[PDB]
Every structure is written in C-alpha cells, then in structure tokens.
Amino acid sequence: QQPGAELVKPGASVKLSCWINWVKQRPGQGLEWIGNVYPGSSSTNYNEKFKNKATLTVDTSSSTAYMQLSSLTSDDSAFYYCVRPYWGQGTLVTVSAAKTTAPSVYPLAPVSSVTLGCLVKGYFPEPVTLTWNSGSLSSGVHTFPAVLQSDLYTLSSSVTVTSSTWPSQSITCNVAHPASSTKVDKKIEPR
Amino acid sequence: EIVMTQAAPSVPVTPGESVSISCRSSKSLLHSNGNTYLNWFLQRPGQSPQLLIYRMSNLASGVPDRFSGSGSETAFTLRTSRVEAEDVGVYYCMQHLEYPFTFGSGTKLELKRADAAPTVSIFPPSSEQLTSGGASVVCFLNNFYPKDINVKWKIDGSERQNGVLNSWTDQDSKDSTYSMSSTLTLTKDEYERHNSYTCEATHKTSTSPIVKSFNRNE
C-alpha cells in the first residue's frame, strides 16, 4: 500500500512509502526497474540511471519500505510502484509548481436504457478515482481520461442502465481526489 | 544491461482467435540453474501490471490456462488461445536474470470486432455549475467501432470549435468498443445568451451524422 498522489515542487524532494523492487512508469509509457532494496540488511541495490536519484531506505519499526527522490523535474512526474511479486497501488508523482485544487463534481442528468454522467472539473494534480454506487454499478460505465486545461484537469464518466430503473433505483457518482484528501458522493437527480 | 525487444507495438486479433506476442533479449536468459528468467505481464488502463507467466513458461496462479509462454534462450512467444475482450491491454516481457532488470516495449493487443455506430447523449450544465458561473455542455459518443470519430458542436446554428475538450477511452474490456467524451465549456454569461446547443457525431458506420441538441428555453 502506497499513497495515491504527491505534488512535489520542482527542485524539491519527496519521500515515498510502501526484496522490495521499485518500478517507474510515466503515464502512457512503459516501465523501468529502479532498484531492489532489502529491509533484512538494509541492502539497497540501484539502477545506474537512478543511483543518484533515489535511495531505497527501509524501516523496521514501521515495517515499510521507502524510496526517496531528490530535486525533482517534470521528467520525474510519474507512477511509482513498490512491488514485493506483490504490486503496490503506486503513487502518482506530479513534479509541478502549481497548487492542489479539489474538483468540483457535477451531476449530469438527461435533458430502453438511460445514460447519466458525472463531470469532475477544475482539479490538480491527478489522479481522481471514480465509481458509481460505490462500485456496485460497473457494467455500463465509461470513464474518460482527464484532459489538462489551463493548469487544471477535467474528467467525466458516464453510466448507462435500463431506463425503468432510474430515478427509481438511485444512482450516485463517487469521486475521490487523493491529493486533496477529499471525496464527493453526488446523487444524480432528475432535472 | 540486457535489451528486451518486442518488434510489434500492437497486434490485432479476432475474438475467439489465437495470437502470439514475440519478444527477444540481447542475451540468453537461461541461467545455469536451468531456469529461463523471463516474465510476462498484462497491464490494463489504470491498473498495476499483473504477472501471467514466470520463469519463461510458468502460468501464474489465478491466471487462465489460455495464456502460455514458450521460446528459445533469446526468442520468446506468448500465445493467447481464444482471446476474450477482457484480454485487451498491453503485454510486456521482462528479464530478471541480471541487474538491472529490463522490460520490453509492450505490445498492445487490439481486438477486431464488428463496426458499431455511437450512442450519443447530450447534457446541459447542472444547476450547481451554473451557480458558480460556469457552463459546461457535455456530449458522450459511446460504444462505437472503429476508433476514429469526429464531433462537431453548434451554438444557435453556428459551428463552434474553441472551448471544446475531447477525451477517448482505451478499448472496452467488455465489448471491445470505444467511447469519446466531448465537453464545450462556456462561462454562464455566454451560455445564457444563446438558445440552441448541438452535438454532431460523424462515424465510419454512416455518412449521416448522429445529432443531439437541446434548447435552453425548451
């Protein structure tokens, strides 16, 4: 288990938490093995390219592995996963000077099936997690990649169900924004 | 360090058909201990990779017996028999024989299915966004195939091209279709000075567009 996001300023450093391997992946790209550490004897092993970037210093008291990134650049913005072959959830590091902003979350109601949506606008940094009815509704859901506009992200999601079951059987869009520790559960209501 | 190569960045396949993703290492991954240290992973949009095969040919626990890896000491082949929509994603090969471990470039599996026209839905700004002075009009073009699609917005009969944000999903793991969202953002001041708002989708499946509109005064 690792945190969802970390908005580190350019030049600043960041201490990320978790045989503990570490993999880097820039959104939309492939993966790079950064290095395997060993809590048993604090036996850290680095990839040359990162040897000077990260430090796999563990912790017996917390019983958690760590990796630190010093003086970050937008080239460091990426997903960092800490795998044991147990893959962690990864932390999305966003090396930017911009500040955190929680999303506004708006219900998208219309006007044999019906389509409702959720618009998540004006947040920074990424990511956001979106589910419908806390995950109970998954079959007719589409979630669109966020698009960066004026230093802010906007995302949307649609869900389609049998027309006779809405609004009779409630539908709520759940959005979590890790960077701001905020969540919004917006019920879709008839206009 | 060892260089892992996957000649194909993508490979199509008919649902229910077999396919093979090839990969190669610049060095032999067959360790004297008799084990060929090569892994295979599948990565789905927004999900951490997941092992499918380990030690060159061992099927991972929980993994269906449809996947299996074979290959010499430097040439590997992942085969998927009777592919399912659920298999779309990007497949990687990895060597962990020597440090530093290295990955192939990934081969995206693309399912080829029957063409389908998009279902278009248009949504006016919510009352909440309007209270805050913004006015986003959203149009969803869902479950179409092939991937290419064009959207055109009109306001009071005139085409509008600025203020539009478009986003596409990766291929659907349930039905192998694509979907696209198009959002026209105006300020409330402007949104309140026009009446007609129109979303037009033009897709391969037809030379006639699918049009959805609403009138703010309707």
* Chain A residues within 8 A of B50 when measuring between CB atoms: 87
Cβ contacts of A42-51, under 8 Å, gap ≥ 24: A45/B99, A47/B99, A47/B100, A48/B100, A50/A24
**Elucidation technique:** X-ray
Whether B27 and B130 share a structural domain: no
CA distance A81 to A186: 31
Q: How many domains does chain A have?
A: 2
> Of A97, A121, A152, which residue constitutes the final position of a domain?
A97
Whether A124 and A184 share a structural domain: yes
Give residues with Cβ within 8 angstroms of B61, minimum separation 6.
Answer: none
Whether B83 and B60 share a structural domain: yes
Strands (E), B44-195: 50-54, 58-59, 67-71, 75-80, 89-95, 102-103, 107-111, 119-123, 134-144, 149-155, 158-160, 164-168, 178-187
Q: Which structural domain, as residue segments, surrounds residue A50?
A: 1-97
CATH number of the structural domain spanning residue A144: 2.60.40.10
CB distance B50–A21 less than 8 Å? no
**Do A47 and A32 meet the contact criterion of CB atoms below 8 Å apart?**
yes
Give residues with Cβ within 8 angstroms of A180, minimum separation 6.
Answer: A100, A101, A102, A123
Whether B1 and B104 share a structural domain: yes
**Can you read off the two tokens belonging to residue A13?**
């450093």
Task: Map residue B163 onto helix, strand or coil.
Answer: coil
> Could you tell me the maximum CA-CA distance found in chain B, to the nearest angstrom?
77
**Can you read off the two tokens belonging to residue A42?**
């604090």
Element at B131 (helix H, strand E): helix B127-131
CA distance A83 to A20: 6
Name the resolution in angstroms: 2.0
Whether A19 and A60 share a structural domain: yes
Whether A114 and A174 share a structural domain: yes
CB nearest B138 (choices: A47, A104, A117): A117
Instruction: Tell me the CB-side half-sphere exposure of residue A151, using CA atoms within 13 A.
Output: 7
Whether B149 and B188 share a structural domain: yes
Residue in A with minimal Cα distance to B181: A144
Whether A38 and A67 share a structural domain: yes
* Chain B residues within 8 A of A149 when measuring between CB atoms: 165
Whether B125 and B137 share a structural domain: yes
Whether A79 and A102 share a structural domain: no
Whether B109 and B119 share a structural domain: no
- Three-state secondary structure of chain A: CCCCEECCCCCCCEEEECCEEEEEECCCCCCEECCCECCCCCCCCCCHHHHCCEECCCECCCCECEEEECCCCCCCCEEEEEECCCCCCCEEECCCCCCCECCEEEEECCCCEEEEEEEEEEEECCCCEEEEHHHCECCCEEEEEEEEECCEEEEEEEEEEEHHHCCCCCCEEEEEEHHHCEEEEEECCCC
CA distance B29 to A166: 56
CA distance B75 to B36: 11
Q: Choose, out of A37, A45, A158, A166, the residue to mutate when testing the contact with B (most B CBs < 10 Å).
A: A158
Whether A74 and A139 share a structural domain: no
Q: Which structural domain, as residue segments, surrounds residue B172?
A: 114-216
Whether B89 and B9 share a structural domain: yes
CA distance A138 to A120: 18
CB distance A121–B140 less than 8 Å? no
Whether A136 and A183 share a structural domain: yes
Element at B38 (helix H, strand E): strand B38-43
> Of A72, A97, A122, which residue constitutes the final position of a domain?
A97
> Of B79, B113, B147, which residue constitutes the final position of a domain?
B113
Whether B5 and B107 share a structural domain: yes
A89 touches chain B (CB under 8 A): yes
Amino acid at residue number B161: Q
Whether B150 and B94 share a structural domain: no
Whether A117 and A152 share a structural domain: yes
**Can you read off the two tokens belonging to residue B154?**
């009109």
CA distance A6 to A93: 5
Inter-CA distances, A83 with B49, B100, B109, Å: 10, 15, 25
Q: How many domains does chain B have?
A: 2
**Do A80 and A87 meet the contact criterion of CB atoms below 8 Å apart?**
no
Whether B105 and B137 share a structural domain: no
Whether A9 and A88 share a structural domain: yes
Q: Choose, out of A29, A87, A119, the residue to mutate when testing the contact with B (most B CBs < 10 Å).
A: A119
Whether B132 and B59 share a structural domain: no
